[PDB]
Amino acid sequence: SRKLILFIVFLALLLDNMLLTVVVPIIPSYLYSIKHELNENVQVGLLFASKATVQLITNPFIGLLTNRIGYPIPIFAGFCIMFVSTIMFAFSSSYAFLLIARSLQGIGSSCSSVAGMGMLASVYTDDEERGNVMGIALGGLAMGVLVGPPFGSVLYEFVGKTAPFLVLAALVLLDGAIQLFVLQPSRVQPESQKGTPLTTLLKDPYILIAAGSICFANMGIAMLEPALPIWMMETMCSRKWQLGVAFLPASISYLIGTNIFGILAHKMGRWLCALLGMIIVGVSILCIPFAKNIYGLIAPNFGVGFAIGMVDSSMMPIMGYLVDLRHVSVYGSVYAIADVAFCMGYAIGPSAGGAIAKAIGFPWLMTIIGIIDILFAPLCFFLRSPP
């Protein structure tokens, strides 16, 4: 029975992103009240950039650690680090402790994410099944990104401040108990063969093309998410609720597209799927700045989310397959890069987005992103199978 592994990885990614996104609506209000006692200040943006930066920095080291000692011990250490960090963030009272708690969450997130993706790729050796389960495990990323803020707002309204974090800590306890029940991280078990170090993989043009497609496709929405409400409040003078309701199509369509195209990308071809995904996200971002109301922004956001789901869900199994085909088949070191792409999107996203939007404007930012996506799109023709 290898469905328990899939369940553990789905739950790990879910709770990771639930925490990452539940922190977001709360801490501005708490920081403002503590100060009394733009959308991003000099300090506020750091609390969202640090989780992604520390994870980006510590992905490559986990890449080699999993080869040295195996997957279960990193996964369990990720559980423990995330649990302790969540309680610390629940009870923390000062800003520096917010910083160190966010950094510990980032370290634990890197541990669990990289080791779990490697373990999935290691248990599901078949190509088609690998894709079908990568789809479902990725659906949990976008299912935490979607249900985080609602959960946070409801629990922070009814019970109190510490309630969402204590509930998430209880969920992490249950996940760790399931891990001890199935994984049993008892001993240190070295892997069989060598690992083809990162300096050898990073010279491969096809791995570079795949990672760059993931990076740009995700950087699109990474720079679209923060700067859309600012431009909306100026151009339409919309009410507080239309800001939140405007972005639901992107998240809903991301979830649906991930879960469907996991299974559906092996029938059309993963290179064709990535090519059409790049074209569609480019056209949608180019079409955004022409809207008038939210009725104008309903369809382009659906296009963006659907296309990003296509790209990611068809470009992860291809990383696994490229390693299987051209190098030694161990997956921690290549999913290190695959996750560095995601984190690179989410780290410098809001800062550079806001800077460029202030410098030249919102339509120019959107046009630049769209043209870059459309121009990278033809490179995904080199990933087609020789037969």
Resolution in A: 3.2
Instruction: Give the single-character DSSP code of 92.
Output: -
Do residues 150 and 270 both lie within one domain?
Answer: no
Do 173 and 216 belong to one domain?
A: no
- Cα angle vertex 87, ends 82, 90, to 5°? 125
Residue whose C-alpha is closest to residue 182's, from 81, 107, 18, 71: 71
Instruction: Name residue, tokens 């339509």.
Output: 363
The owner of tokens 């080699």 is 64
Q: Are residues 130 and 223 in the same domain?
A: no
Two structure tokens written together for 309: 């789901």
The answer to whether 315 touches 214, Cβ cutoff 8 Å, is yes
Structure tokens at 99: 């910083």
Phi-psi domain of 94 (left: phi exceeds 0; alpha: psi -120 through 50; beta: other)? beta
Task: Report CA 62 to chain centroid distance, whole Å.
Answer: 17
Domain CATH code at residue 93:
1.20.1250.20
Q: What is the DSSP letter of 205?
A: H
For residues 174 and 179, what is the distance between their CA atoms, to the nearest angstrom? 9
Way the structure was solved: cryo-EM
Residue with tokens 């997130």: 109
Contact 139, 255 (CB under 8 A): yes
Q: Residue 67, exposed/middle/buried by CB under 10 A (0-12, 13-18, 19+)?
A: buried
* Residues 180, 52 share a domain: yes
Of 191, 225, 254, which closes a domain?
191
Residues 222 and 348 both lie in one domain:
yes
Other Cβ atoms within 10 Å of 7 Cβ, number = 15
Q: CA–CA distance from 133 to each of 261, 274, 297 (Å)?
A: 11, 18, 32
Whether 14 and 58 map to the same domain: the answer is yes
Evaluate whether 345 touches 219 at the Cβ level (below 8 Å). Answer: yes
Nearest to 78 by CA among 45, 127, 118: 118
Which SS3 state, helix, strand or coil, does residue 214 take?
Answer: helix
Closest CA relative to residue 374, chosen from 296, 279, 242: 279
What's the domain range around 266?
196-387
| Domain endpoint, select from 149, 165, 191 | 191
Binding-site annotation, residues for serotonin: 141, 145, 218, 221, 225, 247, 254, 312, 346
Neighbours of 206 (CB within 10 A): 14
Give CA 310 to chain center in angstroms. Answer: 14
Number of domains in the chain: 2
52 & 121 share domain? yes
DSSP string for residues in 163-194: HHHHHHHHHHHHHHHHHHHHT---S----SS-
Is residue 148 located within the same domain as residue 221?
no
Binding residues: 141, 145, 218, 221, 225, 247, 254, 312, 346
Q: Which two tokens stand for residue 49?
A: 């950039």
Q: Which of 164, 191, 218 is at the close of a domain?
A: 191
Q: How far is CA 367 from the centre of its chain?
A: 24
